[PDB]
Design a protein around this ligand. Structure first.
Ligand code: HEC
Ligand SMILES: [Co+2]
Length: 106
């Protein structure tokens, strides 16, 4: 629902992916992450509450989720092919992007 909930969903499901036993488990976790990222994209983070909704910072925040979703969709392709280790490695690529948004806006 709220931004913090979406972030907890992202964090929890990344851990699910790391411990997963098959690619369908990775797929199910990635699917939840995709929805949480799109929900978070509609939020205004506390650090930007005073900025204009049309500000460059707000568009940058939103675009961070578009890039994250693209990564999730690429990992989903691998998971849907049964490639568990590759899909797990693709999911780890997410982390630098999580951190880059946090450095600016957390
Ligand atoms: C911006 C484009 C973000 C991306 C990509 C990711 N996160 Fe994030 N996260 C973002 C903000 C603005 C905040 C602060 C939220 C607030 O209301 O203060 C956060 C916070 C987190 C947290 C802590 C949330 C909490 O406990 O309340 C976690 C655990 C977290 N984020 C995880 C996380 C992961 C794993 C991401 C990539 C898969 C990720 N975030 C991306 C902004 C953005
Ligand atoms: Co990237």
């Amino acid at each position: 629902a709220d931004l913090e909930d979406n972030m907890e969903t992202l964090n929890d499901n990344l851990k699910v992916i790391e411990k997963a036993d098959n690619a369908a488990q990775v797929k199910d976790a990635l699917t939840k992450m995709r929805a949480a990222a799109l929900d978070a994209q509609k939020a205004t983070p506390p650090k930007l509450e005073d900025k204009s909704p049309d500000s460059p910072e707000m568009w940058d925040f939103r675009h961070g989720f578009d890039h994250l979703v693209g990564h999730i969709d690429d990992a989903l392709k691998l998971a849907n092919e049964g490639k568990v280790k590759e899909a797990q490695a693709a999911a780890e690529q997410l982390k630098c992007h999580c951190n880059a948004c946090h450095q600016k806006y957390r």
